[PDB]
Amino acid sequence: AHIVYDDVRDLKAIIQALLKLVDEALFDIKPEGIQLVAIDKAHISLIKIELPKEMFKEYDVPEEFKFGFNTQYMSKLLKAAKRKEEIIIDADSPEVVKLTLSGALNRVFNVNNIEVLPPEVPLEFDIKATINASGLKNAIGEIAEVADTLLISGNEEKVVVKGEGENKVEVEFSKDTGSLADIEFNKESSSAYDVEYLNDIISLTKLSDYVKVAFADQKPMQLEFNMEGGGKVTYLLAPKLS
Ligand SMILES: [Zn+2]
Ligand SMILES: [Zn+2]
Ligand SMILES: [Zn+2]
Ligand SMILES: [Zn+2]
Ligand SMILES: [Zn+2]
Ligand SMILES: [Zn+2]
Ligand SMILES: [Zn+2]
Ligand SMILES: [Zn+2]
Numbered sequence: 001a002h003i004v005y006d007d008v009r010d011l012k013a014i015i016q017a018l019l020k021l022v023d024e025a026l027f028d029i030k031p032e033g034i035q036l037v038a039i040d041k042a043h044i045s046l047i048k049i050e051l052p053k054e055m056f057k058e059y060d061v062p063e064e065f066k067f068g069f070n071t072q073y074m075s076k077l078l079k080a081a082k083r084k085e086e087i088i089i090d091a092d093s094p095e096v097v098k099l100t101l102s103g104a105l106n107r108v109f110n111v112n113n114i115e116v117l118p119p120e121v122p123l124e125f126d127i128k129a130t131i132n133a134s135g136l137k138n139a140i141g142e143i144a145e146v147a148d149t150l151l152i153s154g155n156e157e158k159v160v161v162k163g164e165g166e167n168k169v170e171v172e173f174s175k176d177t178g179s180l181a182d183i184e185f186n187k188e189s190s191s192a193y194d195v196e197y198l199n200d201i202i203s204l205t206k207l208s209d210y211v212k213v214a215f216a217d218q219k220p221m222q223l224e225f226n227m228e229g230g231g232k233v234t235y236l237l238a239p240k241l242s
Helices: 008-021 069-080 133-146 195-200 204-209
Strands: 001-007 024-030 033-039 047-050 058-060 064-069 088-095 094-102 107-112 127-132 149-154 157-161 171-174 182-184 188-196 209-214 221-228 232-237
Touching: 001 008, 008 033, 008 047, 008 069, 008 195, 008 204, 047 204, 069 107, 069 149, 088 171, 127 133, 127 157, 127 171, 133 149, 133 171, 133 195, 133 204, 133 209, 149 195, 149 209, 157 182, 188 195, 195 204, 204 232
Parallel strands: none
Antiparallel strands: 001 058, 001 088, 024 033, 024 064, 033 047, 047 232, 088 094, 094 107, 127 182, 127 209, 149 157, 149 188, 157 171, 209 221, 221 232
């Protein structure tokens, strides 16, 4: 296997979110691309990653292999990688993966593979809204500072998020707020979620300018981050009743 990706910052943002859900995870490296699924202990939130070969500068993987890793270990390896730089992965045997960070002058890490079994992995929505990622990020952070639950409601024109309780750090996403690019509307809906979980994965918002937010009354919220080249990271969060 030999892979070159043009921007280590995206892997960094993915690892920052994963370490909040799990201590270990598994990249399933196949000839057509890389996949990963991680679910937290309580089976309340999950992250799925799909990185097709088409999104990499170089991707030559004649044989599949599973790369198990400790999320905090990888976060610290990547810690000193602030600028957009290439990351090269070459693995000739199961046991170790060589990661080379380019630019910001050369760092090479030989990472030993560890055993990690993939979650025993098992979607209809009332509203699916494409909204400004930074706007959502701001909203999640502000609500988390003052509430424990984020309420979301949507109709044919907008999605509104606010914290549950007295006054409201309320934020509206719509064309008239210049933050909604598109919306698929089936039925007006309102749901509730633990904002602590959403704040944990806020780094995924660096992956794309827009995020597709999908939900239905008392059903999971789904956030989809579509990346350039066909990449997609999906975050799923179980609902509260209200
Ligand atoms: Zn090879
Ligand atoms: Zn190469
Ligand atoms: Zn090789
Ligand atoms: Zn109405
Ligand atoms: Zn109407
Ligand atoms: Zn909570
Ligand atoms: Zn947490
Ligand atoms: Zn509540």
